[PDB]
Structures are given as structure tokens and as C-alpha cells.
Design a protein around this ligand. Sequence first.
Ligand SMILES: *[C@@H]1O[C@H](CO)[C@@H](O[C@@H]2O[C@H](CO)[C@@H](O)[C@H](O)[C@H]2NC(C)=O)[C@H](O)[C@H]1NC(C)=O
Ligand SMILES: *[C@@H]1O[C@H](CO)[C@@H](O)[C@H](O)[C@H]1NC(C)=O
Ligand SMILES: [Ca+2]
Ligand SMILES: [Ca+2]
Lengths: 216, 232, 112, 129
Amino acid sequence: SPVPEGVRLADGPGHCKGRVEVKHQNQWYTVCQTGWSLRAAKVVCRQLGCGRAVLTQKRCNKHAYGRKPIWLSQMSCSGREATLQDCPSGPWGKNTCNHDEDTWVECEDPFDLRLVGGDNLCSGRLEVLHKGVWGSVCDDNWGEKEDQVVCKQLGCGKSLSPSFRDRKCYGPGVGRIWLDNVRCSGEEQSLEQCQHRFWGFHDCTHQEDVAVICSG
Amino acid sequence: IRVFAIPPSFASIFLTKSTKLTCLVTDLTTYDSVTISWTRQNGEAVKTHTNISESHPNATFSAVGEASICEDDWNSGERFTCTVTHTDLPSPLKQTISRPKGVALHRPDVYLLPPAREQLNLRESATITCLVTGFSPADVFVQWMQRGQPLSPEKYVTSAPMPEPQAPGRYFAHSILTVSEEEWNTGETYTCVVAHEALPNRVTERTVDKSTGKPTLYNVSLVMSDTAGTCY
Amino acid sequence: LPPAREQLNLRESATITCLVTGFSPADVFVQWMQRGQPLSPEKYVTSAPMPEPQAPGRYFAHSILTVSEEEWNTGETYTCVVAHEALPNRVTERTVDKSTGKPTLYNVSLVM
Amino acid sequence: DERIVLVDNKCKCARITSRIIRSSEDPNEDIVERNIRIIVPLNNRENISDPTSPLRTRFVYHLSDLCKKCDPTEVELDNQIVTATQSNICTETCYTYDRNKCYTAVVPLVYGGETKMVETALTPDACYP
Ligand SMILES: *[C@@H]1O[C@H](CO)[C@@H](O[C@@H]2O[C@H](CO)[C@@H](O)[C@H](O)[C@H]2NC(C)=O)[C@H](O)[C@H]1NC(C)=O
Ligand SMILES: *[C@@H]1O[C@H](CO)[C@@H](O)[C@H](O)[C@H]1NC(C)=O
Ligand SMILES: [Ca+2]
Ligand SMILES: [Ca+2]
């Protein structure tokens, strides 16, 4: 049986949304396996690295030009397993695609962060990308532990504890306060891996923002 | 011969994300000469999916036939009908289905009732109750969870909506979950997820636990000071 | 089941549940009486027998009566008389009230 | 370690903890305890952002509006992820000040005739500009 070389998610806005297109040896075709739970969508999203699977559904075919043939094996995958290579597949046989429907999948935008307002980077206001928008992080709880996690992710070195005397050189923000009550205990790898309140809910003002100055 | 055609409720639409139509046929004799057909309002045919189940104690056969049409056509108000032909029946049967229109939307309330005190003295089992009420129309989906993982369906039973005697146009339903007494005394947590069309976000959640219930002790303490004008 | 406290807090009505299980065969009749006087059939809604998935051969049902908040607060009593052939006297009763519960305490401390 | 914090309000300085004590040995005879700790200010005024407001000598503490949850949570349904409303109940008065917050005011300053309004610090230290 063919081994998937990759997934591309064509016919969708960007490459984190669209129709599931398994790369068959040489020419590739669309797949409509039954029991398409979110577990397989999570592995599909992890193939591209977009982020977390949010939704999967099969859409009615009304002159959608589904020229791509269909596969002949199932892909029962536990979701916590590795790439599509390491999940069992049926021994060829017939297809489970009775109703002619395309499989849809909706991944999420990847995370990103930066410092704005500081010279030669490694300093300034904190902006985090989510839902395709940048925003500020509240300073209600900003311990020294929460400062070093941001610094190493951008490779700016250990923070030098600049206090608030030089934190007035960046000013306030205008964007939405995405994060609040951030509590980072361990190093982890990303700020999103910490415990926060929620995306979009806060009790802060643009005057109270977070400024992080690393070594550089 | 009896033919039942159930429409797809919004509860199925929420989870399956697919609108399918089923025409249950009961008391069938010859399954080699039957045809489950689905047609639109003009006469166009729709591709069907007929599956024949196993045998029955009363020497009858059950016919299950799925027809799939996506929600854009169905929610617009178009009418469908089911036809079952049999070589023993001189005339094919016609059963039509469609979704009603013109009903107001009222937000439902969620109530969780802890188990009775006189039940846990037997050291046998407990019973938690999830109550949803005052909602229109009569469509509701209730599912229980524990630690973020769905429970086995048997552990709980959900009933159909019933009218409310004191308020016209409003209904209610119930859900019952059974758990061990030692599990409840340990301090595990449970969750009742309720979905209805009239909710602001379409999904609501409540949680019950032994610790956060009715306390026997109310150790209230009040401290007065003339200098503590701020609290960290 | 005593009525929900939050339902009373919002001050519309109260919900009294009569949960009866563990009877066989499927033959049960529940009624609602207040102060020894049976209430009208239009006061409660009666469920229907249906098998218990856990233990086969057992059926169960329930009945709910809505009461006014002031009527519930005034201290009126309610009961759920049940009838079953297997019962010794064919009549069993369970009764609750507002006072039905366990006595609480208040260890108030005032630090002047 | 044996207590769990439910609410940690700062405006009303209210804190509620719950704990189960294994009294005796029967599992059905363990008491559930609820502790409430309230610190009341005797010098703060009606409006904490206006020094001219009169003094406050009446405090009301509703426990139904204190132990309330108002933040949508994520729920997995094996086919999608949805946001769920915790409570349906969701202008509150702040009795005491908050350390994590800054309180400022506008005051007229006259010198040589000209009047220069300047931002003040009602709180002693709080945060810095
Ligand atoms: C308590 O004091 C505040 C501050 O004076 C009042 O809110 C201010 O109202 C003025 C106009 O009257 C605005 O210029 C300020 O922007 C307001 N402050 C804020 C933070 O927005 C508030 O109305 C007072 N409360 C009462 C009950 O009088
Ligand atoms: C009363 O307070 C004391 C401590 O001051 C505590 O030991 C006792 O348990 C409290 N009473 C109750 C009924 O909780
Ligand atoms: Ca702050
Ligand atoms: Ca905060």
C-alpha cells in the first residue's frame, strides 16, 4: 500500500485550511475515510506544523469538480501518535467513501512574538501574534521567571534586570491585551505553554504594559 | 408494514456536521425486491444508501436507508418525501418530512442536583441529576464528562422533551448519571455539557463536586482596622 | 429531591423530583398530595417506564411538581405516595420540607 | 495544603476556602467547612477616586455575586473545539484599593496667576509612571 509522502491541504485559504490531499506515490488524490475524528486532523495539522486542529467536516459535492480519485485504505490514528507513517492502515480493499463528500480540516495560525520600540531588538514592548493580530501582554503579574522565558525564545540572552527606570522609553500600546495573569514557572519552550487567563479577557489598560529588556 | 422517517435534529447537526435522512422500514418479508427511494419536491432523484440488518425474532426485516443533502438546501424550507416499494404492496407508500418554521427562541436554564443523603447510606451507588428547562423549541443535547474525557453512554440515560404545565410554549428534560459511592466520597468532579440553538455561544457547562456543596460549618471571620485601606 | 436553591434565589418557582427505581415488572403509579389532600392531575407530569441499562430487568420513572416561591416559603408540606404490588402494604411514602436537612452552626468571630 | 482557595477578591478583600475533615471513621459523617475572611476599611470614603466624597459606614457582601465564574472555557467534543459559558448570571464597587493598580487624580495648581492642572497619586506609592 502507498505510504503518504505528505499532505498539502489544497483548495483552501492558505495552507492551514482546505481539503485533505494525501500525496500518493507520483500523482496524489483526495481521501474521504469514514470515522474521520479530530485525532487524524491533529496529525494532519502536525504534518504541516500550523498548530492545533479546530474543526473537521464533510461537505456536500455540488459541482465541486472532485477530479482527484479517492484512496482505498483507512487511516485509524490515535492522534497522540507520530506522523501518518506510524498509524495502522487497512490492507487495501474497497473504499468506505459511500457518499461523495470532500474531507475538510481547519488548523490554527502558528504562534509568534517580538519586541517593538527597543533599539537593535532584545528590548521594548511585547507583542504576541494570535488570530492574525498583534497585541500587548498585561503587567499585573510579571515576575523575573516570566522575563527569562521570552528572552531565550528569541535568543537575546539572560535578562539583566533593568527595573522600571528604563522601561519608560517604549510607552504604551494600542492593540488588544491578548494575555493577562501570565504565570510561567518552568523554562518550557514558549509563552503559550504557561498558564494564562484567556485570549481577549483582561482587566488592564494600555498604560500598564509589559517591557522586557534582555542582555542582547 | 410500518415505515418511520425521522428528520435530522440540530443535535445531530452539531456533532456529525452532516445532514442525513433515514426511512426506517419495519415488518418486511421480501428484502430481495425492495427499493428505498428519496426524491425532492420537483421529482429529482437523490442517491440512496440501503443497508440490510440481521434477522429478527418475529421473522421480519428492517431496512435502513440514508440520504445525504447538506444543510443549505434543507434549512431553506424545501420539502422531502420517502418512498418504499414492495412486490407484495400494490401501491408504494409515501411519507413526507420537513422542518417547521415560526417558533420563538428562549434560553434554557441548567440545574445540577447532588445525590440524596438517604441513598449513600446503603453503600451501593449514587445518582446525579442534570436538569434543563424552559426552552423552545423542543431540541436538546446533553452529554456527561469526567476529567475532559467522555463517559461511556450507558452510565447515563437522557429522556425526550416534555411540555411544561405552568407555561405554554416551554419544555423541559432531564439526565441521570450513576456512579459508585466510594468514587463520590473520594472527591471526583463531573460535568454536564448542554447544547441548544438559543444559547449565546451554543454550549453551556456546569460542574458538581462533593467539596463545593452544602457545608455543615460556616467559620465566618471579620477583622476591623483603621489603617488597612488597601488589599494586595 | 429538595428544590434547587439558585432557582429559588431567582424567585420564580421550585422543582420537586420523585425518583423511584428498582421495581419489576413495569407497573407503577405515583400521586402528589399536600396536607393530606390529593392534588389535581394537572399539577404534575408523569414519566413512563423504561429499562435500566446497568441492571437488566429493572424499570424506573419520576414525577415533577412546580410550586410557587411564596407557597414553598410559607412552610407547606408535600409528599410522593407510590403504589406497587410488590410492596407489603402497597403504599410507601417519602416526605421532605424546607426544614428537611442537617442542623448547621455559625462560628462567627469579630476582631474589633 | 489542606485548603483550596475558591475566591481571592481584592476590592472587597474577600477570601473563601473549603476543606473536608475526616471526622470519626464513617465516610458518610464528614463535615464540610466554609471559611470567609473579610477585612473592612474604616478610613476609606464612598468613591475611592474622589477625596471629596463623604465617608462610608455601610458594607454589603453578597456571596452569590462573589463566587461566580465569567470566562468562556474550551471543551473538546471529539469533532471540534467550542467555547462554553460557565454561568448565565454574568458596576461593582471597589471598597479597598488594589496594589496591582494605580489610582490618579486631577488637581488645579496656581502659581503667579497661571493655573496648571497636574496628575496626582492618591495612593501612597502603588506603581510608578
Ligand atoms: C468616582 O470618581 C470618578 C473619578 O472622578 C468618577 O469618574 C470620572 O468622571 C469624570 C467626569 O465626571 C471623568 O472625567 C473621569 O474620566 C471619570 N473617571 C474614570 C476613571 O473614568 C466616578 O463617576 C465617581 N463615581 C461616583 C459614583 O460619583
Ligand atoms: C471555631 O473556630 C475554631 C478556631 O478559632 C475552630 O477550632 C473550630 O472548628 C470552629 N468551629 C467550627 C464549628 O468550625
Ligand atoms: Ca498592573
Ligand atoms: Ca488581571
